[PDB]
Design an enzyme around this catalytic site. Structure first.
Site, PDB file in Angstrom:
ATOM      1  N   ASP A  24       0.749  -1.220  -0.157  1.00 44.25           N
ATOM      2  CA  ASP A  24       0.051  -0.102  -0.030  1.00 44.25           C
ATOM      3  C   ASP A  24       0.758   1.413   0.038  1.00 44.25           C
ATOM      4  O   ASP A  24       1.928   1.240   0.330  1.00 44.25           O
ATOM      5  CB  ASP A  24      -0.997  -0.107   1.154  1.00 44.25           C
ATOM      6  CG  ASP A  24      -2.075   0.933   1.028  1.00 44.25           C
ATOM      7  OD1 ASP A  24      -2.629   1.235  -0.217  1.00 44.25           O
ATOM      8  OD2 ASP A  24      -2.884   1.346   1.840  1.00 44.25           O
ATOM      9  N   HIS A  41       0.589   3.006  -9.710  1.00 40.76           N
ATOM     10  CA  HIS A  41       0.426   1.506  -9.784  1.00 40.76           C
ATOM     11  C   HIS A  41       1.791   0.864 -10.617  1.00 40.76           C
ATOM     12  O   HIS A  41       2.048  -0.197 -10.540  1.00 40.76           O
ATOM     13  CB  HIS A  41      -1.005   1.410 -10.521  1.00 40.76           C
ATOM     14  CG  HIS A  41      -2.240   1.426  -9.757  1.00 40.76           C
ATOM     15  ND1 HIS A  41      -2.224   1.115  -8.475  1.00 40.76           N
ATOM     16  CD2 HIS A  41      -3.425   1.867 -10.086  1.00 40.76           C
ATOM     17  CE1 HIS A  41      -3.529   1.387  -8.010  1.00 40.76           C
ATOM     18  NE2 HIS A  41      -4.344   2.172  -9.096  1.00 40.76           N
ATOM     19  N   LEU A 131      13.891 -18.244  -4.255  1.00 40.46           N
ATOM     20  CA  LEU A 131      12.762 -17.442  -3.549  1.00 40.46           C
ATOM     21  C   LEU A 131      11.480 -17.834  -4.313  1.00 40.46           C
ATOM     22  O   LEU A 131      11.485 -18.011  -5.459  1.00 40.46           O
ATOM     23  CB  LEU A 131      12.926 -15.867  -3.311  1.00 40.46           C
ATOM     24  CG  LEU A 131      11.987 -15.257  -2.489  1.00 40.46           C
ATOM     25  CD1 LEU A 131      12.624 -14.002  -1.866  1.00 40.46           C
ATOM     26  CD2 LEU A 131      10.690 -14.873  -3.425  1.00 40.46           C
TER      27      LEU A 131
END
Length: 237
Positions: A24, A41, A131
């Protein structure tokens, strides 16, 4: 019936192995630069890749990132349309990387273009041994618990399990996000809520909220969250 007093086990038996990310602050970041929301974005995927590469060097094994909540469906068509288009770029950023990429969430509601990019991304990365990035796209905590409940009801109606077999371990195996659960949740942008990200999976997670906006969240910010995680263990371990 119920019995909790003889129930031992614990789901899946100093560095956090699994980090959950609520990315966020991007809209706020754009507005205070005087930019359109869309410029914020555009930071999400490349920032997520940057965090994966840093995290991989520190020996973190799993990142679950909240890319697209079910709440996004309540915004202007153009904004939803931008976002669903934008997430095709997951292929470009990750297909030729050393990161293993899974998606969790309801794929069926996404454009088949996005669906196929998602499917290509999982396929090309499936063999990477570093990962593991889980991308939560059209995903909610309520959704995960409900799809699990439905799966268990089906098994029961086909004589695969008895109500007395329903336990932590059986339920967990039916969720899209399975243990090992997140050791640490990081939320950028200043809000101190989980916003229906993971619910079941956050039962023993350490919560770290920072006012840092996602596009300003860098290696320094991540090492600070990890050092905070380590001091909490010295205090409460």
């Amino acid at each position: 019936s119920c019995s909790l007093n003889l129930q031992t086990e614990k789901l899946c038996y100093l560095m956090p192995k699994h980090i959950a990310l609520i990315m966020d602050g991007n809209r706020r970041w754009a507005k205070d630069k005087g930019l359109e929301v869309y410029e914020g974005h555009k930071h999400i995927i490349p920032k997520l890749k940057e965090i994966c590469d840093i995290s991989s060097k520190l020996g973190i094994q799993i990142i679950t990132a909240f890319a697209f909540s079910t709440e996004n469906w309540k915004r202007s068509k153009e904004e939803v349309d931008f976002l669903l288009q934008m997430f095709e770029e997951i292929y470009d950023e990750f297909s030729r990387s050393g990161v293993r990429v899974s998606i969790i969430g309801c794929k069926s509601d996404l454009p088949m273009t996005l669906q196929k990019c998602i499917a290509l991304t999982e396929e090309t990365t499936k063999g990477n041994k570093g990962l593991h990035l889980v991308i939560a796209l059209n995903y909610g905590g309520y959704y995960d618990i409900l799809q699990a409940t439905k799966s268990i009801v089906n098994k029961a109606m086909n004589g695969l399990l008895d109500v007395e077999d329903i336990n932590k371990n059986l339920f967990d195996q039916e969720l899209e996000s399975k243990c090992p659960n997140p050791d640490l949740l990081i939320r950028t942008g200043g809000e101190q809520r989980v916003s229906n990200f993971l619910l079941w999976q956050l039962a023993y997670t350490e919560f770290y909220f920072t006012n840092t906006l996602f596009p300003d969240f860098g290696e320094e910010d991540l090492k600070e969250a990890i050092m905070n995680f380590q001091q909490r263990h010295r205090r409460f371990g």
